[PDB]
Design a protein around this ligand. Structure first.
Ligand code: NA
Length: 135
């Protein structure tokens, strides 16, 4: 449980954004403040984050294995036929390997800002992702 991430998507613009394809390849997804309460990625599939709302994802390594947390998701634009906005990848591996947080993709109608990631040894930490559809 030393390897964990909290990802907070904050819609700071005026247009809805949508999450799809959340998947942890290592570790689990869990409820806020509750690593023992696992949650399904399907609870997030297609969820809309409205203006000024936040959506929180919590992921951690396994309780009974030397396994960190790794995963991906996409943000898409529900006003534009779920057009891809950005792809996201996280990795907080068990052991000495540094952490990774990677945002990728091109959709010039959107601005995406993130901060909080710990790229050194230890947990990736709490990453806030602000989203804004440009006017
Ligand atoms: Na690590």
């Amino acid at each position: 449980y030393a390897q964990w991430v909290i990802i907070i998507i904050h819609n700071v613009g005026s247009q809805d954004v949508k999450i799809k394809n959340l998947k942890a390849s290592w570790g689990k997804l869990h409820a806020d403040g509750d690593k023992d309460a696992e949650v399904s990625a399907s609870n997030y599939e297609g969820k809309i984050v409205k203006p000024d709302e936040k959506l929180q994802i919590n992921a951690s390594g396994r309780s009974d294995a030397a396994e960190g947390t790794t995963g991906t998701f996409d943000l898409v634009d529900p006003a534009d036929g779920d057009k891809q906005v950005r792809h996201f990848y996280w990795d907080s591996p068990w052991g000495s390997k540094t952490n990774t947080w990677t945002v990728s993709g091109s959709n010039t109608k959107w601005m995406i800002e993130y901060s909080g990631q710990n790229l050194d040894s230890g947990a990736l930490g709490t990453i806030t992702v602000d989203t804004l559809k440009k006017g």
